[PDB]
């Protein structure tokens with residue numbers, strides 16, 4: 131096994147966790163700040179969560195911007211960038227799921243970006259030239275992405291069919307309110323999506339090259355084990371507080387930097403999946419459920435050791451040849467996704483694979499030609515993975 | 521099974537981890553600052569670490585203060601506090617173990633304390649009235665306490681036989697340099713002490729009362745499993761980087777706030793142990809190895825469920841009655857400490873238990889009369905625990 135690489139870990143986001151944790155929200159925002167509350171397509175109005183937020187900040191200088199959609203659009207967000215500049219917003223409060231949080235991270239950085247440069251430049255450069263951003267916090271209504279306490283975001287330009295990520299410490303939220311009760315109203319589709327996303331985030335940082343990082347491994351395995359136990363329960367028992375709190379906390383811990391610090395990371399499943407969302411409109415987690423089992427089969431030898439550890443530690447699979455244990459672990463993973471209600475073949479979404487050449491052209495356009503922890507997933511390999519996922 | 525309590529988790533310490541991670545040190549400290557490098561009895565001069573730190577901060581306005589011995593003494597630290605006030609120090613850099621870091625946390629707070637109040641008041645109030653402190657960073661040479669990325673400190677006043685803790689967010693280090701290579705020089709005694717302290721920190725937050733916090737449980741179990749595997753290897757292979765890296769990271773993750781957030785915590789072993797260090801001079805971890813097995817036997821009824829989970833998850837103990845399993849778990853724990861070279865009976869250290877009445881007087885003086893997660897360890901229970909530890 132290889133060793134940990136040197137790392138620099140900073141996890142500054144203050145977490146306010148639990149039932150009624152919104153009581154601590156007002157405290158976190160500077161009293162003289164001009165706050166823009168961002169939110170999504172309207173679920174927060176129906177549930178009363180937006181009203182709770184507005185009441186927490188009663189008397190403060192508050193504006194609202196609604197309409198940030200799943201796979202948040204540059205086209206949507208430029209409206210808020212204009213508003214933020216013209217109204218001199220000095221603090222952003224994101225209320226919703228990962229799309230709302232990510233859209234708000236983009237607004238935060240875009241507002242301070244050089245005036246004469248199209249802020250889509252952030253996505254073309256992965257956020258490396260971001261020098262500052264408007265501070266933000268969040269109230270998370272959907273556990274999936276860990277965006278509440280990480281420095282990443284995924285923004286789409288819908289006109290041209292691009293879905294790309296950026297990263298910058300400047301868009302790391304100052305705080306996050308995590309109240310499991312706010313997740314009770316999630317449609318099961320989204321509950322399942324969130325369990326899958328947290329699961330896949332974990333394996334992107336854990337089912338990789340073997341490194342003797344025992345805490346990282348145990349923590350990753352712990353998240354996976356918890357999602358397998360309580361994920362399905364969150365569908366059967368939607369208002370079980372303990373179950374929903376376990377899922378919410380698992381999703382946070384899957385991508386705040388801790389389990390990936392100094393260890394090789396894959397992300398190929400994510401990169402391949404992004405193109406499926408961009409071209410075909412599939413939910414982010416749906417694309418991962420399709421790509422992951424096909425990718426793991428294709429990459430079963432570079433990933434042999436960690437697939438075998440995963441098989442044993444997460445699924446209690448120990449018997450047979452390495453090939454048999456890996457087949458069984460992949461099958462168990464596919465079944466887990468399917469049983470959550472997340473199908474794992476392109477044909478389940480009415481896609482026959484004729485779009486694969488077009489997806490590869492988009493991968494190439496986006497510089498996704500040497501994917502994976504070994505930088506060995508070329509366009510011919512990506513073609514084979516997509517083909518296997520039909 | 522009970523539920524998670526609401527919590528407020530903030531872990532702001534930047535971690536610079538790995539071989540030669542001191543190359544990131546200079547960047548962290550403000551150029552304009554007047555830095556006081558604090559250190560211990562002299563090992564840092566002998567090894568070469570203090571020179572690496574001075575080399576890293578070459579040209580900057582630095583001062584030095586050595587002499588902070590294990591169980592950092594109020595008398596010594598007040599000499600540092602006077603130096604900090606006279607020289608207008610604006611930043612502290614602790615280079616050493618937990619005693620050095622903790623002593624520096626006290627210097628940081630006591631220096632800003634009201635001039636006409638004895639800053640030992642900090643320990644009388646547990647740090648509750650601390651309004652500010654001089655910012656600090658650290659370079660850790662001994663993994664044990666997790667003090668590098670927590671807001672706690674334990675100071676001794678040798679004059680009056682006191683060893684007491686304070687807590688304040690103001691003494692949380694801005695950064696911590698964690699280079700496993702610096703731990704290679706640790707005497708076996710201190711390697712063992714660190715493994716034990718990390719182990720006990722974890723069980724203080726985990727072997728309590730059953731709460732359905734699955735991530736907390738898996739993470740705590742993960743630290744414990746890792747310390748059992750690689751702790752003995754750190755003695756046998758002192759220069760094995762991967763092994764030393766696993767132990768160092770485990771100790772960090774054992775007390776940064778993560779695994780204890782919203783869950784019941786015990787700390788009774790620590791409170792009873794502090795009085796053994798103050799009275800008899802035992803290393804902190806030696807006092808924990810003595811007290812823990814005795815306390816668990818005494819509290820086997822209230823701790824039943826988590827002792828059984830501990831037994832299964834950490835020691836693979838599944839067969840037999842509940843009492844047989846608990847006995848085997850306690851026995852396994854005791855053996856583990858002993859095989860690290862840390863005896864678990866007072867008589868192993870030449871203490872016959874005649875000091876127990878005097879220990880109870882000190883516990884009473886310090887308000888340690890209703891200890892444990894159920895606040896039910898009274899002085900007569902503490903007597904019973906000490907007596908069983910003979």
Ligand SMILES: NC(=O)C1=CN([C@@H]2O[C@H](COP(=O)(O)OP(=O)(O)OC[C@H]3O[C@@H](n4cnc5c(N)ncnc54)[C@H](OP(=O)(O)O)[C@@H]3O)[C@@H](O)[C@H]2O)[C@@H](O)[C@@H](O)C1
Nearest residue numbers: 170171172173200201227228229271274275277282315316
């Ligand atoms: N920042 C990051 O590090 C990452 C972000 N990712 C990105 O995150 C986005 C997905 O975020 P999610 O949190 O999964 O979901 P969305 O925010 O899109 O929301 C999905 C739907 O759920 C609904 N919803 C959210 N909270 C609800 C509530 N409690 N009650 C009822 N409905 C609720 C939303 O409905 P509304 O828009 O009406 O609010 C939305 O349709 C995708 O765009 C994905 O690419 C991922 O790529 C991830 O891998 C990495």
Ligand SMILES: NC(=O)C1=CN([C@@H]2O[C@H](COP(=O)(O)OP(=O)(O)OC[C@H]3O[C@@H](n4cnc5c(N)ncnc54)[C@H](OP(=O)(O)O)[C@@H]3O)[C@@H](O)[C@H]2O)[C@@H](O)[C@@H](O)C1
Nearest residue numbers: 560561562563590591617618619661664665667672705804
């Ligand atoms: N801040 C906190 O959260 C807590 C701190 N605790 C407190 O922490 C203190 C113990 O700290 P540790 O890190 O275990 O050890 P110390 O700092 O006292 O040092 C012990 C000896 O180790 C030696 N040492 C440290 N780094 C070395 C190196 N790498 N090479 C060779 N020798 C080295 C030290 O020798 P020197 O003084 O010459 O430097 C010391 O004698 C005790 O006073 C304890 O009460 C604990 O109570 C803990 O439970 C919680």
Ligand SMILES: [Zn+2]
Nearest residue numbers: 717721790804
């Ligand atoms: Zn301790």
